[PDB]
Design a protein around this ligand. Sequence first.
Ligand SMILES: O=C(O)c1cnn(-c2ccccc2)c1
Length: 167
Amino acid sequence: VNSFSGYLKLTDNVYIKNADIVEEAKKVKPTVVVNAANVYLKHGGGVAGALNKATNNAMQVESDDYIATNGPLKVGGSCVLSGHNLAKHCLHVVGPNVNKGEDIQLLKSAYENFNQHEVLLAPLLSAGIFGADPIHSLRVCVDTVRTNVYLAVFDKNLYDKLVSSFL
Ligand SMILES: O=C(O)c1cnn(-c2ccccc2)c1
């Protein structure tokens, strides 16, 4: 048993809810919250801007130190950093940004990072301002992630479309 409430069960391991991932993290304080990161860990907008704002910019300060030491992530890659006031850990995952021309085949590699963690609270990778089709992102998630993933979908309209079109 875990603390996640109000989710619709899609598969053995994938759950979904219409929720603000920031508000959900603040309420649950999960072991792992996933950030929709870019390779520079520049948390300007979308999910990353919202998570970082909720940390009072502490996520960005930690991220800048990480990049100064390690250099940029790979598209499809990840790193584990603090979850600050939102979670124990933040798994920063870089899905391909379609609005920058990145190979959508890298979305499966991105979701494979989730398999290193038993339970996660996550957004749909490469959705929103990353430009991918969220229906596709949910299918790759279901077909790739084997650990228990709780998906927060901000937009109620999109949530309902994802549920009603799910195979
Ligand atoms: O609410 C969300 O989490 C979400 C993810 N993707 N999108 C979205 C919004 C507009 C156009 C494409 C995707 C919304």
